[PDB]
Amino acid sequence: WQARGLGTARLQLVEFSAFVEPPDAVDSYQRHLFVHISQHCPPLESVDVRQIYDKFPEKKGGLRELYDRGPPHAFFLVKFWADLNWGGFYGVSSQYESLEHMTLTCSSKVCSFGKQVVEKVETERAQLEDGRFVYRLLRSPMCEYLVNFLHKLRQLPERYMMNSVLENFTILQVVTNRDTQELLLCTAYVFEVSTSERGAQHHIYRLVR
Ligand SMILES: *CCC(=O)N1Cc2cccc(Nc3ccc(C(F)(F)F)cc3)c2C1
């Protein structure tokens, strides 16, 4: 009964993206994806969660405890290769599906050297479409820390230097049923930089113990 993409029978990720629209987008629209998961559309490889304890805040909110809460089958790792060739709008959009009408709490902890730099928490509430309930956290604004991190990171003269910094930069993302405090989806993000010719790309793992 193992996961075949990023979700559970109780909450699935439809689509995630982090993006910038340039100011000339009003003239003709364009967006650049830094990172992108689409599951609008085989079992998933696994990673032992102890291997990535150290990259994360290791106290309340942290990947150790949340796994100990369970359920373990809600836990994933996403390796992102971010695409970094591009006063615009810097945005994040998430979209989730469920069969339950729920109210989600959506936390994103940014940890830099495994250490919580910013936490953003939004709650979102269901809408009913084709039987499934749909949760849209669309066009949430990027944390200013990431926007300025991105501008610094892109100017590094060597891609191995970006991957050296990004080896210390992680994001933990926890989706909770607000009414029952009850964990649906935990996603740990680690990052490299992709190349010029390749765009954004990702690989999803199960997290196990
Ligand atoms: C604080 C901003 C926020 O809520 N985000 C949550 C989140 C989760 C995953 C990815 C991103 N965006 C992102 C990730 C990595 C890069 C970089 F290029 F540096 F690798 C840029 C953007 C967010 C933003």
GROMACS .gro file of C-alpha atoms and ligand atoms in nm:
model
  233
    1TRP     CA    1   0.000   0.000   0.000
    2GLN     CA    2   0.303   0.222  -0.054
    3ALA     CA    3   0.309   0.574  -0.193
    4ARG     CA    4   0.334   0.626  -0.568
    5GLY     CA    5   0.378   1.000  -0.546
    6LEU     CA    6   0.376   1.279  -0.289
    7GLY     CA    7   0.066   1.223  -0.085
    8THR     CA    8  -0.155   0.998   0.121
    9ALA     CA    9  -0.502   0.858   0.054
   10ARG     CA   10  -0.599   1.132   0.300
   11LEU     CA   11  -0.420   1.430   0.141
   12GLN     CA   12  -0.252   1.445  -0.200
   13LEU     CA   13  -0.035   1.717  -0.349
   14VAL     CA   14  -0.178   1.825  -0.684
   15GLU     CA   15   0.080   2.092  -0.769
   16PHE     CA   16   0.357   2.293  -0.605
   17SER     CA   17   0.569   2.569  -0.758
   18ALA     CA   18   0.797   2.854  -0.655
   19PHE     CA   19   0.821   3.122  -0.920
   20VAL     CA   20   0.899   3.480  -1.016
   21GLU     CA   21   0.694   3.687  -1.259
   22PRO     CA   22   0.908   3.970  -1.402
   23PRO     CA   23   0.759   4.322  -1.403
   24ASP     CA   24   0.719   4.303  -1.781
   25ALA     CA   25   0.465   4.022  -1.726
   26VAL     CA   26   0.177   4.271  -1.749
   27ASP     CA   27   0.292   4.347  -2.105
   28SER     CA   28   0.323   3.981  -2.202
   29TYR     CA   29   0.290   3.724  -1.927
   30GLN     CA   30   0.571   3.490  -1.828
   31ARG     CA   31   0.679   3.307  -1.514
   32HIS     CA   32   1.005   3.139  -1.416
   33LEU     CA   33   0.982   2.824  -1.204
   34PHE     CA   34   1.261   2.780  -0.952
   35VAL     CA   35   1.104   2.449  -0.844
   36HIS     CA   36   0.796   2.260  -0.957
   37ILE     CA   37   0.599   1.946  -0.866
   38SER     CA   38   0.293   1.861  -1.077
   39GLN     CA   39   0.069   1.562  -0.999
   40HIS     CA   40  -0.238   1.661  -1.201
   41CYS     CA   41  -0.142   1.345  -1.395
   42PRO     CA   42   0.562   0.260  -0.970
   43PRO     CA   43   0.654   0.277  -0.599
   44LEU     CA   44   0.877   0.550  -0.462
   45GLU     CA   45   1.238   0.505  -0.352
   46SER     CA   46   1.298   0.555   0.019
   47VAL     CA   47   1.541   0.743   0.243
   48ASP     CA   48   1.606   0.670   0.610
   49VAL     CA   49   1.489   0.976   0.803
   50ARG     CA   50   1.776   0.954   1.054
   51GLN     CA   51   2.014   1.041   0.768
   52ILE     CA   52   1.864   1.392   0.751
   53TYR     CA   53   1.790   1.461   1.118
   54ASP     CA   54   2.090   1.695   1.134
   55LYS     CA   55   1.974   1.922   0.849
   56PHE     CA   56   1.663   2.026   1.043
   57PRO     CA   57   1.565   2.214   1.359
   58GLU     CA   58   1.591   1.913   1.598
   59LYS     CA   59   1.345   2.050   1.852
   60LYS     CA   60   0.967   2.093   1.868
   61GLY     CA   61   0.853   2.135   1.510
   62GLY     CA   62   1.152   1.929   1.401
   63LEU     CA   63   1.184   1.622   1.187
   64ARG     CA   64   1.273   1.388   1.474
   65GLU     CA   65   0.961   1.469   1.678
   66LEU     CA   66   0.719   1.485   1.385
   67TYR     CA   67   0.813   1.135   1.275
   68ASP     CA   68   0.765   1.022   1.635
   69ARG     CA   69   0.416   1.172   1.625
   70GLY     CA   70   0.347   0.978   1.308
   71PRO     CA   71   0.198   0.873   1.090
   72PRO     CA   72   0.522   0.761   0.922
   73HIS     CA   73   0.353   0.713   0.583
   74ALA     CA   74   0.297   1.092   0.561
   75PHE     CA   75   0.669   1.170   0.541
   76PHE     CA   76   0.859   1.248   0.222
   77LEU     CA   77   1.185   1.397   0.101
   78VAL     CA   78   1.208   1.615  -0.211
   79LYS     CA   79   1.546   1.671  -0.371
   80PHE     CA   80   1.509   1.990  -0.577
   81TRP     CA   81   1.743   2.108  -0.850
   82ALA     CA   82   1.650   2.477  -0.857
   83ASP     CA   83   1.661   2.680  -1.179
   84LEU     CA   84   1.840   3.010  -1.122
   85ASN     CA   85   1.878   3.169  -1.468
   86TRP     CA   86   1.625   3.451  -1.498
   87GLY     CA   87   1.116   4.395  -0.822
   88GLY     CA   88   0.908   4.123  -0.981
   89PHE     CA   89   0.657   3.914  -0.790
   90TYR     CA   90   0.810   3.616  -0.609
   91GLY     CA   91   0.544   3.359  -0.537
   92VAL     CA   92   0.462   3.016  -0.400
   93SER     CA   93   0.153   2.814  -0.490
   94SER     CA   94   0.038   2.487  -0.333
   95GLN     CA   95  -0.269   2.281  -0.419
   96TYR     CA   96  -0.398   1.975  -0.232
   97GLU     CA   97  -0.682   1.728  -0.281
   98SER     CA   98  -0.870   1.518  -0.029
   99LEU     CA   99  -1.186   1.313   0.003
  100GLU     CA  100  -1.234   1.475   0.347
  101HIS     CA  101  -1.369   1.821   0.401
  102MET     CA  102  -1.096   1.947   0.634
  103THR     CA  103  -0.930   2.272   0.733
  104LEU     CA  104  -0.555   2.256   0.670
  105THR     CA  105  -0.283   2.428   0.864
  106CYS     CA  106   0.018   2.471   0.635
  107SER     CA  107   0.355   2.541   0.797
  108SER     CA  108   0.676   2.608   0.605
  109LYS     CA  109   0.991   2.622   0.819
  110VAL     CA  110   1.303   2.747   0.643
  111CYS     CA  111   1.610   2.608   0.820
  112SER     CA  112   1.953   2.749   0.733
  113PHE     CA  113   2.232   2.535   0.872
  114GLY     CA  114   1.948   2.329   1.017
  115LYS     CA  115   1.812   2.623   1.213
  116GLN     CA  116   1.480   2.794   1.181
  117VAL     CA  117   1.519   3.125   1.001
  118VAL     CA  118   1.157   3.192   0.903
  119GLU     CA  119   0.831   3.009   0.964
  120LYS     CA  120   0.521   3.087   0.762
  121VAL     CA  121   0.186   2.936   0.864
  122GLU     CA  122  -0.135   2.964   0.661
  123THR     CA  123  -0.467   2.794   0.722
  124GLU     CA  124  -0.680   2.692   0.424
  125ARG     CA  125  -1.025   2.540   0.396
  126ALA     CA  126  -1.181   2.298   0.155
  127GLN     CA  127  -1.366   2.350  -0.172
  128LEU     CA  128  -1.558   2.071  -0.344
  129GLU     CA  129  -1.480   1.982  -0.706
  130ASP     CA  130  -1.556   1.654  -0.887
  131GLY     CA  131  -1.620   1.482  -0.555
  132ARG     CA  132  -1.273   1.551  -0.420
  133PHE     CA  133  -1.215   1.848  -0.192
  134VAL     CA  134  -0.952   2.092  -0.317
  135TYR     CA  135  -0.729   2.325  -0.115
  136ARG     CA  136  -0.564   2.616  -0.298
  137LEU     CA  137  -0.288   2.818  -0.135
  138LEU     CA  138  -0.215   3.001  -0.460
  139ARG     CA  139   0.024   3.293  -0.516
  140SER     CA  140   0.135   3.310  -0.156
  141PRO     CA  141   0.422   3.562  -0.148
  142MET     CA  142   0.773   3.430  -0.103
  143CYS     CA  143   0.939   3.503   0.229
  144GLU     CA  144   1.174   3.798   0.186
  145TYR     CA  145   1.455   3.584   0.324
  146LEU     CA  146   1.426   3.346   0.029
  147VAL     CA  147   1.396   3.631  -0.223
  148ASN     CA  148   1.718   3.791  -0.098
  149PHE     CA  149   1.886   3.451  -0.057
  150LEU     CA  150   1.797   3.383  -0.421
  151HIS     CA  151   1.946   3.712  -0.543
  152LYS     CA  152   2.267   3.642  -0.352
  153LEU     CA  153   2.276   3.278  -0.458
  154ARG     CA  154   2.240   3.347  -0.831
  155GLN     CA  155   2.544   3.577  -0.832
  156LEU     CA  156   2.785   3.314  -0.699
  157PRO     CA  157   3.040   3.257  -0.978
  158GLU     CA  158   3.048   2.876  -0.957
  159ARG     CA  159   2.767   2.622  -0.946
  160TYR     CA  160   2.955   2.397  -0.703
  161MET     CA  161   2.959   2.705  -0.478
  162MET     CA  162   2.580   2.734  -0.494
  163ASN     CA  163   2.548   2.363  -0.414
  164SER     CA  164   2.789   2.416  -0.124
  165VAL     CA  165   2.562   2.685   0.022
  166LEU     CA  166   2.243   2.497  -0.066
  167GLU     CA  167   2.378   2.194   0.121
  168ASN     CA  168   2.306   2.399   0.436
  169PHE     CA  169   1.964   2.530   0.327
  170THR     CA  170   1.655   2.315   0.387
  171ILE     CA  171   1.279   2.364   0.410
  172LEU     CA  172   1.039   2.156   0.620
  173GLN     CA  173   0.670   2.169   0.530
  174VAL     CA  174   0.402   2.027   0.759
  175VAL     CA  175   0.031   2.011   0.671
  176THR     CA  176  -0.198   1.962   0.971
  177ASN     CA  177  -0.572   1.915   1.014
  178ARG     CA  178  -0.639   2.235   1.208
  179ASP     CA  179  -0.938   2.097   1.397
  180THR     CA  180  -0.771   1.773   1.511
  181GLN     CA  181  -0.399   1.867   1.530
  182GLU     CA  182  -0.348   1.565   1.318
  183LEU     CA  183  -0.062   1.525   1.077
  184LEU     CA  184  -0.144   1.467   0.710
  185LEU     CA  185   0.171   1.548   0.513
  186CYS     CA  186   0.532   1.626   0.603
  187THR     CA  187   0.776   1.715   0.324
  188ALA     CA  188   1.147   1.779   0.374
  189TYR     CA  189   1.316   1.975   0.095
  190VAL     CA  190   1.685   1.962   0.013
  191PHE     CA  191   1.830   2.161  -0.275
  192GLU     CA  192   2.088   2.169  -0.547
  193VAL     CA  193   2.115   2.408  -0.841
  194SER     CA  194   2.027   2.267  -1.182
  195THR     CA  195   2.218   2.364  -1.496
  196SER     CA  196   2.135   2.627  -1.758
  197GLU     CA  197   1.996   2.388  -2.020
  198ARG     CA  198   1.801   2.177  -1.770
  199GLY     CA  199   1.523   2.364  -1.593
  200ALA     CA  200   1.386   2.294  -1.249
  201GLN     CA  201   1.368   1.927  -1.156
  202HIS     CA  202   1.285   1.714  -0.854
  203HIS     CA  203   1.295   1.363  -0.714
  204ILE     CA  204   1.055   1.244  -0.442
  205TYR     CA  205   1.143   0.985  -0.177
  206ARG     CA  206   0.959   0.812   0.099
  207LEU     CA  207   1.105   0.870   0.445
  208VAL     CA  208   1.135   0.553   0.656
  209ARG     CA  209   1.283   0.413   0.975
  210LIG     C1  210   0.912   3.126   0.305
  210LIG     C2  211   0.872   3.105   0.161
  210LIG     C3  212   0.790   2.978   0.152
  210LIG     O1  213   0.685   2.968   0.214
  210LIG     N1  214   0.836   2.879   0.076
  210LIG     C4  215   0.807   2.740   0.110
  210LIG     C5  216   0.887   2.664   0.008
  210LIG     C6  217   0.901   2.527  -0.003
  210LIG     C7  218   0.981   2.478  -0.106
  210LIG     C8  219   1.047   2.562  -0.197
  210LIG     C9  220   1.040   2.701  -0.191
  210LIG     N2  221   1.103   2.783  -0.280
  210LIG    C10  222   1.235   2.782  -0.313
  210LIG    C11  223   1.321   2.678  -0.282
  210LIG    C12  224   1.455   2.682  -0.318
  210LIG    C13  225   1.507   2.790  -0.387
  210LIG    C14  226   1.652   2.791  -0.424
  210LIG     F1  227   1.667   2.835  -0.548
  210LIG     F2  228   1.720   2.868  -0.342
  210LIG     F3  229   1.699   2.667  -0.417
  210LIG    C15  230   1.422   2.895  -0.419
  210LIG    C16  231   1.288   2.891  -0.383
  210LIG    C17  232   0.954   2.756  -0.083
  210LIG    C18  233   0.920   2.897  -0.045
   0.00000   0.00000   0.00000
